[PDB]
């Protein structure tokens, strides 16, 4: 008891400092950054806000609970106040409440007091200049609080932050003028709590009412604030719309646009994983392997944790349907390994041309196939076994009888033996010629050609268009 | 001061991988445990091998008496430093504590290595230290510390010059290149052959002869192979003593394929029971397939398999499934025809592969620059 009682005081001072000065220096600094320059944006405290939010998402967040200075909620949410020279007095009132909190119990517990608190900024009337400061002062307690998952009486409080964000959405439909430089930070912050829309709604069932609401927000941002807005909202669309049918494959067709410019960073890569599974549902394997590889290869630096391992998991799925895959056991991480353990023997069965080896993988690992969600291609891969199996043996064997190859091709009658190779040439597999009497399959090859034209002529536009973009970057980054 | 414990580490490999030896491996382990008075090594061996019955007071009084031999040295260091001399004090405590660390783990070892690092003015004692990191790295199969001691020693050795100990290091780096997969550097650094003679750090000289003659058949060219074994004057006798590998050498040049898999069976059986050769045999075998079949097909562009089947015993339908299944694995790709009786080789791949490295390397090259291009800025 004395140890646990005296170890309570040490923890709070760290949130009492960094959690106090995180939105004070970044938010209060963004106030001066929003008064002028305001180029672009930039508003570098918006990306610094991303660093602080992602910092809280690990440790320590804020709420909890935690029974440490719950008076931080009324601190920033009250006392604009009101015009800038009067706000300076309230800038001293934060220090006044620092002394009040340094004297008495400092209101270490709020809970049901969030009802007057969250409505106090509406009692001030008003900030009135910066809506992102009002939305952030209310959300910063509540957004990390969603990670508690208590599911009692505070879920509707998260919904109240969603209503405050809807007031941020109506103000996202009006001003401007003309030229809002704070709406990019509103795109950032709202995309977060739009994913908190996803989490809080997913506590019970699908959000479908918010699918028409997201389409209302996604379309009302057109065309003005779509920049960096439409990208995050399209992932908010694509993610759960990939979980719930339907039509998103043809919906993103008419939705594009592209939509440029890609922001922010890994956002477009993860979008190419989301739409990567989409474009993989059309089964064209050149665009699917390029969108899946570009999804993972374009994402630094992690941690955390396993969904960046999931894009790598589903990445080589289209490579399994290509007919040739390397053994990936050397790419296993300490985490991704234990997650894909069935998928290991799966791609090992894809390398081999044995049917029973692949079918036993299906019967045993079908439970993990339910966990991943990819099924339909597991039964049709038997056609990849007959095409890779015939690619194997044909190129392999000098002249193979249709009765001897019939074991690995499982039928290979005297009739279909013609089509196996012939319709493989239709798919561009093997050139083997067969004169059918008994018969026997005599595989030869003569090709000397290509390896030339498209690679070098495309490399011209590749390199040139690249260095042109690198011009568009460097030439435009010299403002300082 | 190595081979006794080197055999213990070899006995660890004899216990670890094969599960079918329950008698001789533990017997001679105890025969080597009752000597050198090992403590920490028999703890790891106690968990892997049998737990007895009882050790307890036996090796605890042996570690108590060795502690008296440990405490007579560790209480002599303050009595020796009472006087003053050059290395006549600390050279006793650096080598004997490494013998006291030979009793267990890395502790006295690493702490004496950096201890004496600031004292010895001669490279011979520094290389003896290097020998201690190499033996303790060989027992625990740790390749991290065997690179650093040699990298620091060679600068002092190559400043520089040596005869014997330079050939010793060539055997070391040859054992490290063969510990991981390096085919060329193992035989190239073992080209010294008999000039190393026999040493306690080189263990059995016949085993070293088998190490260089087993690794010289892969990455070395066929004219260079017979130039090493046949033209080599000193290496020819020591490889002649064992007919197992010598039969594989002269029959590989004789091109006869009827003795190959039997001679390779004896070679592979020796490859299985030797340490550090376990990961490398899987590629080593199929490499000997494409090695012997490279001179099989190169005889004639269009070859009649009837002439192949003349003396095989029997190669009529065997080379069909044999070579084919080796073609399907990627070893010696060729297009062969039957009932036309034409084995056609080729395949030169002088067009695709000639220009393929451009687009191939350029794929991942331009990919890796596409990452860094589209990541920044934003």
């Amino acid at each position: 008891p004395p140890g646990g009682g005296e170890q309570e005081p040490p923890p709070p001072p760290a949130p009492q400092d960094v959690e106090m000065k995180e939105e004070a220096a970044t938010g209060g600094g963004s106030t001066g950054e929003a008064d002028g320059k305001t180029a672009a944006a930039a508003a570098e405290h918006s990306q610094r806000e991303l660093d602080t939010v992602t910092l809280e998402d690990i440790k320590e967040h804020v709420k909890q609970l935690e029974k440490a200075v719950s008076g931080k909620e009324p601190r920033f949410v009250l006392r604009a106040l009101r015009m800038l020279p009067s706000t300076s007095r309230r800038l001293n009132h934060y220090v006044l409440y620092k002394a009040v909190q340094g004297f008495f119990t400092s209101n270490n517990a709020t809970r049901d007091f969030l009802l007057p608190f969250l409505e106090e900024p509406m009692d001030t009337e008003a900030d009135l200049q910066f809506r992102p400061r009002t939305g952030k002062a209310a959300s910063t307690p509540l957004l990390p609080e969603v990670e508690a998952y208590l599911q009692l009486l505070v879920v509707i409080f998260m919904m109240n932050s969603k209503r405050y964000k809807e007031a941020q959405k109506i103000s996202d439909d009006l001003m401007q003028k003309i030229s809002t430089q704070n709406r990019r930070a509103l795109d950032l912050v709202a995309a977060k709590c739009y994913y908190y829309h996803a989490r809080v709604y997913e506590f019970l069932d699908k959000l479908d009412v918010v699918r028409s609401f997201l389409h209302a927000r996604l379309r009302t941002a057109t065309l003005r604030h779509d920049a960096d807005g439409q990208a995050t909202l399209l992932n908010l669309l694509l993610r759960n719309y990939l979980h719930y049918s339907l039509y998103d494959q043809a919906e993103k067709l008419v939705s594009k646009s592209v939509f440029p410019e890609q922001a922010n960073n890994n956002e477009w890569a993860r979008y190419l994983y989301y739409t990567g599974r989409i474009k993989a549902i059309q089964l064209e394997y050149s665009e699917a392997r390029r969108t899946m590889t570009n999804a993972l290869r374009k994402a630094p630096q992690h941690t955390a944790v396993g969904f960046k391992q999931t894009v790598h998991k589903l990445l080589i799925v289209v490579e399994l349907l290509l007919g040739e895959i390397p053994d990936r056991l050397q790419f296993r991480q300490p985490s991704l390994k234990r997650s894909l353990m069935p998928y290991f023997l799966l791609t090992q069965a894809v390398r081999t041309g044995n049917l029973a080896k692949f079918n036993q993988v299906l019967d045993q690992f079908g439970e993990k196939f339910q966990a991943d969600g990819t099924y339909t291609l597991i039964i049709r891969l038997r056609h990849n076994v007959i095409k890779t199996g015939v690619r194997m043996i044909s190129l392999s064997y000098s002249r193979i009888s249709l009765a001897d190859i019939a074991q690995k091709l499982q039928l290979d009658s005297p009739e279909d033996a013609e089509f196996i190779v012939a319709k493989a040439i239709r798919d561009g597999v093997i050139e083997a010629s067969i004169n059918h009497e008994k018969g026997y399959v005599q595989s030869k090859e003569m090709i000397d050609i290509y390896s030339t034209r498209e690679p070098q002529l495309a490399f011209h536009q590749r390199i040139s268009f690249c260095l042109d973009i690198h011009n568009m970057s460097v030439k435009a980054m010299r403002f300082p | 001061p190595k081979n006794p414990d080197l055999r213990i580490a070899q006995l660890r490999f004899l216990l670890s991988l094969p599960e079918h030896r329950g008698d001789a491996a533990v017997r001679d382990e105890l025969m080597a445990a009752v000597r050198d008075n090992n403590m920490a090594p028999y703890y790891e061996a106690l968990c892997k091998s049998l737990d007895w019955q009882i050790d307890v007071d036996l090796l605890n009084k042996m570690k108590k008496a060795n502690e008296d031999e440990l405490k007579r040295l560790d209480e002599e260091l303050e009595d020796a430093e009472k006087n003053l001399g050059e290395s006549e004090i600390r050279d006793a405590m650096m080598a004997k504590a490494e013998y006291l660390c030979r009793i267990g783990d890395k502790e006295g070892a690493l702490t004496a290595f950096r201890k004496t690092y600031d004292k010895t003015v001669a490279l011979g004692h520094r290389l003896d230290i290097v020998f201690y990191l190499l033996r303790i790295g060989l027992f625990y199969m740790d390749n991290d510390l065997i690179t650093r001691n040699t990298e620091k020693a060679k600068s002092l050795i190559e400043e520089g010059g040596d005869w014997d100990r330079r050939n010793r290091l060539k055997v070391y780096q040859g054992l490290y290149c063969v510990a991981i997969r390096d085919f060329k550097q193992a035989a190239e650094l073992f080209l010294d052959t008999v000039s190393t003679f026999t040493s306690y750090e080189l263990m059995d000289y016949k085993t070293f002869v088998t190490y260089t003659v087993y690794v010289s058949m892969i990455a070395l060219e066929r004219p260079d192979l017979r130039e090493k074994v046949i033209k080599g004057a000193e290496i020819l006798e020591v490889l002649h003593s064992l007919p197992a590998v010598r039969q594989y050498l002269f029959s590989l040049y004789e091109c006869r394929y009827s003795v190959f898999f039997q001679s390779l069976a004896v070679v592979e059986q020796e490859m299985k029971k030797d340490w550090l050769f376990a990961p490398h045999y899987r590629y080593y075998v199929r490499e000997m397939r494409i090695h012997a079949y490279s001179q099989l097909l190169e005889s004639y562009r269009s070859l009649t398999l009837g002439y192949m089947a003349e003396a095989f015993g029997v190669g009529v339908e065997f080379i069909d499934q044999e070579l084919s299944r080796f073609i399907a694995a990627g070893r010696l790709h060729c297009k062969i025809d039957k009932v036309n009786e034409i084995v056609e080789t080729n395949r030169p791949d002088s067009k695709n592969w000639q220009y393929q490295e451009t687009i191939k390397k350029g794929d991942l090259l331009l990919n890796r620059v596409q990452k860094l291009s589209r990541v920044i800025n934003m």
Binding site: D57 | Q262, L264, V285, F318
Partner: peptide
Amino acid sequence: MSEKKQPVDLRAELEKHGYKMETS
């Protein structure tokens, strides 16, 4: 990051090759 997506969630062969001789 921690932002965006990720926080959401013929043998060798020895015996058989030696046996091919004495098989036939």
